[PDB]
User: What shape does this take?
Amino acid sequence: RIFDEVREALDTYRYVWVLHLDDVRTPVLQEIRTSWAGSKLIMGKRKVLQKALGEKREEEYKENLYQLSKLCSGVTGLLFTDEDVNTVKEYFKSYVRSDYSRPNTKAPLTFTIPEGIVYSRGGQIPAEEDVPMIHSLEPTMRNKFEIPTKIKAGKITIDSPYLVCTEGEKLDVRQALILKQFGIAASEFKVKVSAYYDNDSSTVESTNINME
Amino acid sequence: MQLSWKDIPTVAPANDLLDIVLNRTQRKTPTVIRPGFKITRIRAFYMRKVKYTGEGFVEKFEDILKGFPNINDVHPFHRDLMDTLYEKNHYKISLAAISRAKSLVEQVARDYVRLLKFGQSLFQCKQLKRAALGRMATIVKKLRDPLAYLEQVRQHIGRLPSIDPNTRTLLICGYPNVGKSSFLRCITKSDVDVQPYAFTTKSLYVGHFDYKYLRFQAIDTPGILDRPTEEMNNIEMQSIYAIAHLRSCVLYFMDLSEQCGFTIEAQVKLFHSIKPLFANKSVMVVINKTDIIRPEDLDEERAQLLESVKEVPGVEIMTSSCQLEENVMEVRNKACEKLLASRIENK
Amino acid sequence: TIKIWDTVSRVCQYTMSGHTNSVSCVKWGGQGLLYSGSHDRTVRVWDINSQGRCINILKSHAHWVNHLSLSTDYALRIGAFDHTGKKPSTPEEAQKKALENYEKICKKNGNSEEMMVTASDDYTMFLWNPLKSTKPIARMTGHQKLVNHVAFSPDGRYIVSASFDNSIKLWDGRDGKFISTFRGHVASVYQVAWSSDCRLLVSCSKDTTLKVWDVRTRKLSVDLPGHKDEVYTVDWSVDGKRVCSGGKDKMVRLWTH
Amino acid sequence: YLYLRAVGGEVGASAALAPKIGPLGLSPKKVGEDIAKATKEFKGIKVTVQLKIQNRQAAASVVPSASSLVITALKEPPRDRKKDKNVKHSGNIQLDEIIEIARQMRDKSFGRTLASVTKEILGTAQS
Amino acid sequence: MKYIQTEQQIEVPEGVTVSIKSRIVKVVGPRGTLTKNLKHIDVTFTKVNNQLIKVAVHNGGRKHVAALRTVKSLVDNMITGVTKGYKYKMRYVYAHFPINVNIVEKDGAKFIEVRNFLGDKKIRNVPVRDGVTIEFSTNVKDEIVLSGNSVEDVSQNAADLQQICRVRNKDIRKFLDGIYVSHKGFITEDL
RNA sequence: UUCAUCUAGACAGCCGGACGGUGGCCAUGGAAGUCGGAAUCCGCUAAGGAGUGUGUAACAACUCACCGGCCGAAUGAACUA
RNA sequence: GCAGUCAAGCGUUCAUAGCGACAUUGCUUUUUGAUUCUUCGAUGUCGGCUCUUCCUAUCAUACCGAAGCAGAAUUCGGUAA
Assistant: This one.
């Protein structure tokens, strides 16, 4: 649709940065990009990133950069910036956030399951402060969450408090879905970026987890 | 204990009434050859026509009037329930649209016997049938409109109760969203399962009890009754009001437990609006949870119906709690005994 | 439908519905009442500026009402502006002057009462005083052919109406009585427009001439030939200086003193 | 963290809409009277009711910004009358009489361009 | 467009190989040994590298075209039905009154004798096909095990067992005693 | 036969994501996108149109798409006989 | 009875200059100031008893299926003489 977009900002930077993102979101992602007035994050693609840079030795414009585009076959993205390395690297190691993350991953912490009337608040919060589940979400737990429930005079309840999620355990397509119903964060999203690239130096330097 | 409702069967509006269409169809259909001679095969379709006639004839226009009383029967409260549904509008539109299609059958029979004339040319008959079909169509159109309304309120009367004002009745009403889960539900066994209810937050929880050999039971309409008629440009609040107007023994409900600091000062000057209306109506005040009453609003709220200060005839009040099951039988008993020594004793 | 638009916002304040047929004309009076003529053969009065609700339905005309006129019509079109050409300093003054002008035209027996005339293809015209009453003041008959257009003078004293019958007829605006015919047109007379000075009326006709007639004298003041073809529209300026015309010939001709 | 209402006007009698969960320890009462004095100027907007309370501390933290300080900025003591009532009898009001409010409205820090709030005077104030 | 061949790479592990002759497929497995007859689709298999299967399927302009996928799914049901199996963990979620369900034995058919079913005194002797064991509740209240070694011998009878209490007037919302399938899992927990 | 899209990841089946100012105005009987009317404004982006469900008396929960990851081979809908 | 939307043909060439069928969706009760015998006071006055056979546009009984199907009662459709 838009076809071209990267070539709109070619000769306006000099210190192009590449960031590596694990669990991508939005309300916790626009807390850094919106803060700076010159750091646009590009997450989603992987081949459009080197449009104004080049992926080959005949379709590039700079030296020692085509080898970097080959390592862009993951969940990483670029960053439209031109600041100092030290003033942007330290900032990445000071931002933490806990969320639900993605399923199929051995997540820590232990969540207990209450017995009786179900709620939608949490586990550490007492039942005297919790809120009863409304009469709407019923067939979504009799097949998707495969949880044995037992209705009692209108109000839907359960039978035995069988634990299905704990520290060091992975499930399927309902691991990070049963935590969303209550409101308990699982894993903690930590900023773990990759390396970078300078036009003036024409060199690369693997940092953090990218260090081989 | 009934009136004159929930006896009328189902009524097909317009979409479920496609029968006329089917009939007109078979009609225009015909095409017979008539046995005997091939030169005298012109005599038969007259019978055809008489047939169609009788058909639409019986049709409807009499089953609609059944199930509905009169616009001026006895008490206006019997028609007040319809005001919060179809409104005197569709009301008259009740018997109104009634007589409407009603005479409709008139025009019907009319044109009917009308064509009736001739019993030659089955073809001409097809045209006649088509005309009849068109006529029928131009009717049930606007028909089914309000008729849709019809079917609606129709089924409607299955959840709405209907008491009898021609006997003893104890008006019992309470205020939800406080703690009636283990208080008001200790009398009856009403619970929301499938049947829904708008207006208020809860549904219809009418209490009932059978002491000795008497019969005391009445529903409650919270919301509209707890506010003046002028404030409600319609809705049911007014519903609450007429609801009241009905009764024999109105029982007001209070709560001095202070759930979140919801004391009464503005609704004090509201009981006088229905005070002269209670010519032969006994009153009773029941306060839930009477033990945690702090001396901060007690020396001001007591000058309402508790003590002999304002708008009080001089009745007996009760201060207890049915939630802790403390003499719940005594409270229920001492709230209808006054009616026995009033209307029953005199009449 | 007639749609009322808030000009600044381009918002639709009200959609006046209820007419069964096309709404051919609309005028908006000083009282804040909208008057319309429609193909449904009705003339309707609406409380427009206000609720946007329909107050009156007058069924009186036999055929489609194509044109209507207010006794105030000219004054309201111009607002505050008159022959002097003075424009007031502030917005308040502009409104006050416009209201003052409106009152002068509208007052009969010293009281504001806007009058309305409507014209039908039936050749019938009804003179109405809607504020005072639903009953028409009078029915004006006499035209041989259709009344295409009707106009009150700016003062609202008299009415000149253009008719197809080759005459434009004069009527007393108050009572509706028939004064006289202005013969002179050979062919159908399409429209009439009154001068700001209220002495004259200009018409444009099929005969391809414009005729300014001194209504008071009831004599033809000036005949202005020049159009090759039929003249459809005529207008007389607020300042009074020029009359404009346009029509089948496609060329505008402006006429001056 | 939790919000709760009742009837239009914290008086009534017992026909309120307060189920359970009492804010600020036990027996709120005075808690509900704290939000009544946290309306800054005069009351008006009361649509989708809100009530924010911190950990064991009933304080005020509800700033409508462009929901309550807009109607009172039209030099009109009451509220909206009928439909599309921009200002009092004008159309193009002074932009400097609203740019001072948008300056303070930046504690969220989610946007970037300052010229966004004042740019909505025809598609917001006139709608 | 009348395809000449639509070969599909069928992944078949060792130990559970099948016998290929005409249109009959053999089910080899330690957990029960059953057979299956196919005389309505006319298929043909060809061995070239044990695991994978490369054949030639003609007629591609009617309803055939890819008549291998409709068989491949049936093949997996015979492989994962003899190894992983098909345990339909159906839960009896019902209130009303404690139904006394007693399954008796008769000619090795095990007719389910339902006594007092929601006020009904009718003995519905539902026929049970061989090749599936049916137990009762042990640790979890109301649970029946439908662990079988086939699909058309377990799921086929389960559909008739569910629609055996059909009522003319009453349906499903009259009482929450309807027998629904909770989760169509397998016998093996790891697979 | 006539045509979008079609190696800077087409078109399905899944996962992940679906964000603010702002609780936008008349009706509190209920109504924080989800029975009408007045209607289709900005900023921040790889992407985010006041909107076709489920219905506790109102959110988060479930159902989903211009544009992605994975998969890597043809093609989404409307006609003519 | 009249009046729209969709527009397949025709208009030497071209869907909307002039025209425009077969459906569906409204209003209205005037077959176009009703061309010389027309919209009417007129019920075809040819059927019944007993006995045999057959069909479906299926009122009832049996077996499925609607709906705010609570129970009960009532109404409708399809497959069957």
